[PDB]
Amino acid sequence: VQTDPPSVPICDLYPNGVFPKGQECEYPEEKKALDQASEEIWNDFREAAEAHRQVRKYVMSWIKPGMTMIEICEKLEDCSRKLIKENGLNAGLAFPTGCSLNNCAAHYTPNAGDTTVLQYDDICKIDFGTHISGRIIDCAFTVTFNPKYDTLLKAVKDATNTGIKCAGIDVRLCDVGEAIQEVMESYEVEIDGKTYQVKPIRNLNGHSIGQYRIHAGKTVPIIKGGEATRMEEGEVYAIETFGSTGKGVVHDDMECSHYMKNFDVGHVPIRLPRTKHLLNVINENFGTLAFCRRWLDRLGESKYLMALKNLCDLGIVDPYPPLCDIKGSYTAQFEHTILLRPTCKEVVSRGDDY
Numbered sequence: 001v002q003t004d005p006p007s008v009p010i011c012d013l014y015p016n017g018v019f020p021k022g023q024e025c026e027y028p029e030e031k032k033a034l035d036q037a038s039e040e041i042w043n044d045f046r047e048a049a050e051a052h053r054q055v056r057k058y059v060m061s062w063i064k065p066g067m068t069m070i071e072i073c074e075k076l077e078d079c080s081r082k083l084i085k086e087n088g089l090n091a092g093l094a095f096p097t098g099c100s101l102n103n104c105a106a107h108y109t110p111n112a113g114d115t116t117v118l119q120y121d122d123i124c125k126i127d128f129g130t131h132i133s134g135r136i137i138d139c140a141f142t143v144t145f146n147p148k149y150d151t152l153l154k155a156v157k158d159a160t161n162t163g164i165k166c167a168g169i170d171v172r173l174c175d176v177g178e179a180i181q182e183v184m185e186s187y188e189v190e191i192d193g194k195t196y197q198v199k200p201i202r203n204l205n206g207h208s209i210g211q212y213r214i215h216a217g218k219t220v221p222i223i224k225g226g227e228a229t230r231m232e233e234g235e236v237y238a239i240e241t242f243g244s245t246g247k248g249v250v251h252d253d254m255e256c257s258h259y260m261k262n263f264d265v266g267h268v269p270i271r272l273p274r275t276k277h278l279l280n281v282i283n284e285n286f287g288t289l290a291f292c293r294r295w296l297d298r299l300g301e302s303k304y305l306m307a308l309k310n311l312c313d314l315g316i317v318d319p320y321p322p323l324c325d326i327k328g329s330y331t332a333q334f335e336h337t338i339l340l341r342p343t344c345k346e347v348v349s350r351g352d353d354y
């Protein structure tokens with residue numbers, strides 16, 4: 001039995017090592033055999049998903065205006081580490097806790113010294129990931145306290161659920177985007193006396209997920225006009241949509257906090273001492289998983305900024321700065337991970353919450 005607040009690892013709650021299925025849906029014999037052959041993989045996803053469900057339920061109980069963004073992320077991450085039973089690269093946090101505010105939709109997590117305080121009128125996107133053996137759960141929701149954003153939230157949730165319903169083996173990615181867009185734009189909202197037709201953020205998308213690879217190569221667009229490339233049996237996708245009251249386009253903005261090794265870059269010998277050490281720290285602790293500066297601090301690293309810049313300039317590491325729409329705009333996000341199994345579509349991260 002899990003504690004409140006949560007402290008019992010998910011592994012210890014299901015002793016037989018069999019974890020709960022997410023929501024299974026029929027798509028819009030030999031395949032059953034093929035499905036069962038990868039059971040250990042689905043099971044890993046499911047373990048990671050249960051951890052995600054329990055962490056997020058916990059976060060929803062205490063997240064409140066008044067808290068610093070740092071306090072929020074540290075409290076969330078602490079619980080996540082505990083429930084996933086962090087163990088080097090075999091079990092852990094898949095990527096940093098996004099807590100993007102307002103016009104900012106994605107890739108913001110505070111660095112050391114950030115004094116930002118969560119406000120009553122803030123619209124905060126909590127996007128965090130867990131993994132078991134590199135089987136990643138990428139799942140996200142939006143937190144508000146002012147009911148004025150209720151319809152904006154409902155639009156994006158509906159858009160995400162539409163994307164999830166439309167997804168399937170042999171489904172064209174461009175169709176999913178068109179579908180998402182149609183639902184999203186069917187919503188109009190009124191916030192502080194102004195009305196808006198909700199728009200999808202056109203340069204943001206969902207994505208295929210691979211082992212230790214958050215962005216495996218295929219993208220799921222949230223507007224019409226994309227690639228007719230088809231989804232394939234066995235693939236795993238992060239179905240995420242973002243709605244905005246602004247331009248519906250994001251740009252890089254603010255201090256960068258998120259970084260991730262380029263998956264395709266091989267071993268590179270480095271003699272520069274600080275740069276060498278940092279790359280070793282990244283290889284040991286994150287591999288190709290994304291990390292943030294706070295995660296370097298926590299490992300006792302200091303004076304690493306120039307080394308990190310070197311790694312970026314070399315193309316060994318890529319920076320992922322916050323992506324924000326225009327000043328004054330509001331953005332919302334909902335996201336789930338789905339498994340395109342041979343016998344069905346599993347919304348693995350589905351919970352009783354969203």
Ligand code: MED
Nearest residue numbers: 095096127214258290320
């Ligand atoms: C790179 S960390 C953020 C990861 C995931 N939420 C994405 O944007 O694909």
Ligand SMILES: [Zn+2]
Nearest residue numbers: 127138139140
């Ligand atoms: Zn995400």
Ligand SMILES: [Zn+2]
Nearest residue numbers: 138238240335
């Ligand atoms: Zn994602």
